[PDB]
Structure 1
Amino acid sequence: MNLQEYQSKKLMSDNGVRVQRFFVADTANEALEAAKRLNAKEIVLKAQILAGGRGKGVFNSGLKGGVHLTKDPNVVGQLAKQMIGYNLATKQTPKEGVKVNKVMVAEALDISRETYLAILMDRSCNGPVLVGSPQGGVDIEEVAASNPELIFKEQIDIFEGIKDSQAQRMAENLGFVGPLKSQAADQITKLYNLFLKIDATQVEVNPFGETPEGQVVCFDAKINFDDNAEFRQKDIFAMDDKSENEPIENEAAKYDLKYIGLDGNIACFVNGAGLAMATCDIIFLNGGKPANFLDLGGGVKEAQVYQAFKLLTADPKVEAILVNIFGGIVNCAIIANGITKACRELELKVPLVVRLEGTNVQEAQKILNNSGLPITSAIDLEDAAKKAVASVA
């Protein structure tokens, strides 16, 4: 799931993390009044979209740039008038851009020092870990490659909680000194408790830094959430902005199907994520370009097969479909009849290749061959992949 800048910044602030003071406005007048209420010397206006590259984007109002600095609340309102309700296009958006319904009006803070600080569960140490670097404001992966001596880690015990000694040591390794070390340690502690409270998989602060006036601030952050915890994080998942997701992925999620679009033309779906990945792979190994990953989940349910076809028959780049169902006990003739039912009712127009394993496969293949539809059966996954690849120009 995805949060707008103002949603993650509010979540942070509501949990004691120090961020720039800000308001959200959805009209130009609200932006002007918000700028007045900041009582700040320097103000930043930022359009709220999820895609990157706002700073160099263009609105279909003609206004250049999604981030503007000013001292004048009147200017904030005037520029917001040429943002709100317009589409903002960046290097990371489609050409139509993204409709901007909200802007953030925040105090513009100068940055004296930049560091990197993230909290995540360590898959090799089996607990939370703090990951920090004094080399802030840059891709942490680059820092790891170029300067691995500047990557610091503190393993935390889930039941002990974060200790002052751990927070202080990380703060020191990040380069904070004196009272700012104590501030940074306290902020690390608050970020750790936030990470646990919200079932984050990662809380990444970059830059985690200082202002010239001597405050430790989380200037920008990215939070990733554990989907498995949605049942106890309803308020946070209710904020999920799906407006910039691929539309078919949104439609898939409605039905508990995990769809991931790829850049290809041979669609596929499979019961089981490992085998779904493997089916994408084997299409590629045999000279094709998979169009998507689609895991139907456990249990071969006719409704899941039906919805899968509904998703794929929509995508204009799909030129063929490889269905791979390893159903064990389920009667493949029932699955076969469900497939022909879906292809008729949803008007399949592309070649379909079906690999069925389970019981009653012979009758299932007979059903598919007699359906009058462009359907071919496959004897194994390699045969299915070759047939799929050869079904397209």
Structure 2
Amino acid sequence: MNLHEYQAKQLFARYGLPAPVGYACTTPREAEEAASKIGAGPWVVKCQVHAGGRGKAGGVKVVNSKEDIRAFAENWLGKRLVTYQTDANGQPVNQILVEAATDIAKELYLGAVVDRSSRRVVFMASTEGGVEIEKVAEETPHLIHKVALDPLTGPMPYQGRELAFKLGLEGKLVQQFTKIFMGLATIFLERDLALIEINPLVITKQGDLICLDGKLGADGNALFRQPDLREMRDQSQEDPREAQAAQWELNYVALDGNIGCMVNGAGLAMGTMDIVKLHGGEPANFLDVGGGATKERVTEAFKIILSDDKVKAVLVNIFGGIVRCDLIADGIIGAVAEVGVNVPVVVRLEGNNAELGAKKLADSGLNIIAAKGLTDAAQQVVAAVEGK
């Protein structure tokens, strides 16, 4: 899960890393009052949404009057911010971070992820701050410096110094940089992060390092042992259906298309989406039923997939699982009636009672085709949305 910039900065502060003085504000009044608490302006005001590119979308402004802070807060609170990193629906702005302006001398990049190829937490730094790290990696790889945290020793100061020197830092900036590396590495390990990105890590004109932005991603598989992070989850930043799906043991990711997919298995879910795409269809979503395809779960699955108005048909692809094919068929039937599924449903069943489950579907009289295998299933759902 992602954290807001302000939450990332609170965490940094907690680890003694530096960030501008700032206040997360939920009302324009709090935002304007932040000004004098911060001090002399100008002040940076920032919409807090998980997505990046807020600057390009107008969600980050440097203003110089309480009146402007308030106007910006009034403009954004409760509104959705669309950036190149959110879908066209953007993300709700429920907090405006108001922080002190920072005198920027230079912008650096410092970040860390779990590198799967080397199977290590890898920190990377670059003098190319303020730019998407991907762009810099593509074009000036030689400008990206990396160190892998050694699982046996924990992060070491020489690694922080290595990056610091490769960035051409010198004097106290080397120690400051090393300290930031050590703290961020420590946060990464202790809070089970999957991602840290300080872009930009700024060298201020006064000669100090400061985290001007912060993007933190937590490993969701570790939240059971990260109670603090657990509470920081902001569900408003995600499609609410994902959380609904999850509390029902379904993994749902909405897509652009119109052919809903309900499959047991992440791999099969993606494969099913791909095969639907291959046969001319446009998958509307990924939905891995994971959990036992019970009547209740399948019903929820439909409710969730169907909450998307664009869905014109639903392809159910179930291979195996803990529920016999005929029970799944009964459940699909119950879901269809009970949810008032008014779209055509194509079903591909494999396992015990595949053909009997198929019969039950065929005999229900509901608009549900039992397909004969994958390809057929794909072709049929594709055909089922023809004209819709």
Query: 1:213-228 alignment to 2 at 5 Å?
Result: 213-228=206-221
Alpha carbons 1:31, 1:105 under 8 Å: kept: yes
Structure 1 stretch 224-233 or stretch 241-250: which is displaced more?
241-250
1:361 maps to 2:357: no
CA distance in 1, matches of 2:167, 2:129: 9
Give 1:6's aligned residue: 6
1:201 maps to 2:194: yes
The alpha carbon displacement at 1:247 in A equals 3.4
Q: Which of 71, 82, 85 does residue 74 from structure 2 map onto? A: 82
Give 2:172's aligned residue: 179
1:242 maps to 2:259: no
Structure 1 stretch 239-248 or stretch 105-114: which is displaced more?
239-248
Q: Which amino acid aligns with 2:325?
A: C
Q: Which of 150, 154, 160 does residue 167 from structure 1 map onto? A: 160
Aligned residue pairs, count? 385
Structure 1 stretch 238-247 or stretch 266-275: which is displaced more?
238-247
Alpha carbons 1:25, 1:104 under 8 Å: kept: yes
Give 1:62's aligned residue: none
Q: Which amino acid aligns with 1:79?
A: A
The alpha carbon displacement at 1:178 in A equals 1.4
1:33 maps to 2:33: yes
Alpha carbons 1:135, 1:143 under 8 Å: kept: yes
Relative to the length of structure 1, the TM-score reads 0.90
Alpha carbons 1:47, 1:54 under 8 Å: kept: yes
Alpha carbons 2:112, 2:122 under 8 Å: kept: yes
The alpha carbon displacement at 1:66 in A equals 4.0
Alpha carbons 1:15, 1:190 under 8 Å: kept: yes
Q: Which of 282, 288, 297 does residue 295 from structure 1 map onto? A: 288
Alpha carbons 2:312, 2:385 under 8 Å: kept: yes
The alpha carbon displacement at 1:175 in A equals 2.2
1:263 maps to 2:256: yes
Q: Which amino acid aligns with 1:32?
A: E
CA distance in 1, matches of 2:290, 2:379: 25
Alpha carbons 1:270, 1:324 under 8 Å: kept: yes
Give 2:369's aligned residue: 376
CA distance in 2, matches of 1:390, 1:49: 40
Q: Which amino acid aligns with 2:7?
A: Q
CA distance in 1, matches of 2:141, 2:177: 22
Alpha carbons 1:87, 1:97 under 8 Å: kept: no
Give 1:61's aligned residue: none
Q: Which amino acid aligns with 1:360?
A: N
Compared CA separation, residues 124 and 365, structure 1 to 2 (3 A): same
Query: 1:25-104 alignment to 2 at 5 Å?
Result: 25-52=25-52, 54-55=54-55, 65-72=58-65, 74-75=66-67, 78-79=70-71, 82-83=74-75, 85-87=77-79, 89-91=81-83, 100-104=93-97
Structure 2 unaligned residues grouped into runs of 5+: none
Q: Which amino acid aligns with 1:355?
A: R
CA distance in 1, matches of 2:34, 2:157: 37
Structure 1 stretch 222-231 or stretch 30-39: which is displaced more?
30-39
Q: Which amino acid aligns with 2:224?
A: F
Q: Which amino acid aligns with 2:19?
A: V
The alpha carbon displacement at 1:17 in A equals 1.2
Compared CA separation, residues 359 and 25, structure 1 to 2 (3 A): closer
CA distance in 1, matches of 2:109, 2:222: 26
Alpha carbons 1:45, 1:76 under 8 Å: kept: no
Compared CA separation, residues 230 and 325, structure 1 to 2 (3 A): same
Structure 1 unaligned residues grouped into runs of 5+: 58-64
CA distance in 2, matches of 1:40, 1:298: 56
Alpha carbons 2:295, 2:335 under 8 Å: kept: no
Structure 1 stretch 295-304 or stretch 78-87: which is displaced more?
78-87
Structure 1 stretch 274-283 or stretch 301-310: which is displaced more?
301-310
CA distance in 2, matches of 1:32, 1:91: 25
CA distance in 1, matches of 2:256, 2:63: 42
Query: 1:144-155 alignment to 2 at 5 Å?
Result: 144-155=137-148
The alpha carbon displacement at 1:78 in A equals 4.0
Alpha carbons 2:250, 2:291 under 8 Å: kept: no
Q: Secondary structure at the match of 1:204?
A: strand
Q: Which amino acid aligns with 1:367?
A: K
The alpha carbon displacement at 1:163 in A equals 1.2
Q: Which amino acid aligns with 1:251?
A: Q
Query: 1:282-361 alignment to 2 at 5 Å?
Result: 282-327=275-320, 330-361=323-354
Structure 1 stretch 274-283 or stretch 136-145: which is displaced more?
136-145
Q: Which amino acid aligns with 2:34?
A: A
Percent of matched pairs sharing the same residue: 44
Alpha carbons 1:56, 1:66 under 8 Å: kept: yes
Q: Secondary structure at the match of 1:82?
A: helix
Compared CA separation, residues 384 and 115, structure 1 to 2 (3 A): same
